[PDB]
Every structure is written in structure tokens, then in C-alpha cells.
Amino acid sequence: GVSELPELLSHEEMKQNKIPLAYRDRCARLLVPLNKCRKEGWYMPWNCVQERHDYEQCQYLDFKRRVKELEEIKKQRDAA
């Protein structure tokens, strides 16, 4: 049930949670519970189903935001 991007994590909370650098983005807030759930459940496909779906959907919204940006960038490039 993720409708829009969550609030961004602070720099310190990223360091505390040892988030991978490539995944320090808008969805890093939803990654902290998932990596916490993944470790407890031995990463088994059936354990943390809901927390995994929520984070996947967040990256989908971050992706669609980047889809919108490129259309915006092209409009400035087309009209300049």
C-alpha cells in the first residue's frame, strides 16, 4: 500500500543502517525494514512477502518519476 515516495532518510540513518551506496535513494526508508526482514527470514521467498512488495513498488514510483523528468528534459531541449 505505497501510493507515493516516502520521506527521505537522513545521512546518519543511512550510515547506521549500512545501506548499500547504490540504494541510498528516495526509497531507502522502505529498504531498512526489508533488509531487516530478509536477514531474519533467511531471504526465503515466502517470508517477507509484504515488505518486499512495498519496496519494489517504491522503486517503481521512483522510476516513473525519472520517466517524467526525461520527458520534461526533452521539452526544454526541443524548445531551445
Binding site: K15, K18, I19, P20, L21
Partner: protein, 90 residues
């Protein structure tokens, strides 16, 4: 026991004194090996910082890595012949 470096420079001796030139040669060798010892200690800090920090190693170990990359060119054995046989100021 633990012997010590007889701090003696080529600039303060007469080379015709056989024992004094021997000390300046030894003195320069022992100061370079200590700098090699210090460099290895700094590299030990870099390795422990890298292992513990994980993905935070870029930020956490930044100044340790910077110092190791600066000390590496000159914290190595250079010998005593180079400075014994050359006067930099001339």
C-alpha cells in the same frame, strides 16, 4: 637490549673520520626503516577501517586513505648513498 639510532648527519661530519661516516650512514638507514614501520601502521588502520565501515568506508576512512596515498611515494627505503654523495644546496 634495544639499540638506538645514533642521530648523526652527513652535514655535520668529516668523511675522513671513518667511524663518523659510518654513523651517518647508519643513522640515515634507521630513520627510513622507521618511516616504513609508520606507513605499515597507517595501512593497518586503513584495513581495519575498511572492514568495519562496510559501505561507509569512502566517508569513514577518507583521511586515512588520503594519508596513506601521500606517504607511499616517500616512506620507502632510499639508501644513504644518494644523500651522502650529493649536496642539495649546490
Amino acid at each position: 637490549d634495544h639499540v638506538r639510532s645514533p642521530n648523526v648527519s652527513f652535514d655535520d661530519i668529516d668523511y675522513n673520520n671513518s667511524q663518523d661516516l659510518h654513523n651517518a650512514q647508519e643513522s640515515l638507514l634507521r630513520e627510513q626503516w622507521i618511516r616504513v614501520s609508520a606507513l605499515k601502521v597507517c595501512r593497518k588502520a586503513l584495513e581495519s577501517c575498511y572492514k568495519t565501515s562496510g559501505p561507509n568506508h569512502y566517508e569513514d576512512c577518507r583521511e586515512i586513505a588520503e594519508k596513506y596515498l601521500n606517504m607511499l611515494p616517500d616512506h620507502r627505503i632510499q639508501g644513504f648513498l644518494g644523500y651522502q654523495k650529493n649536496d642539495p644546496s649546490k
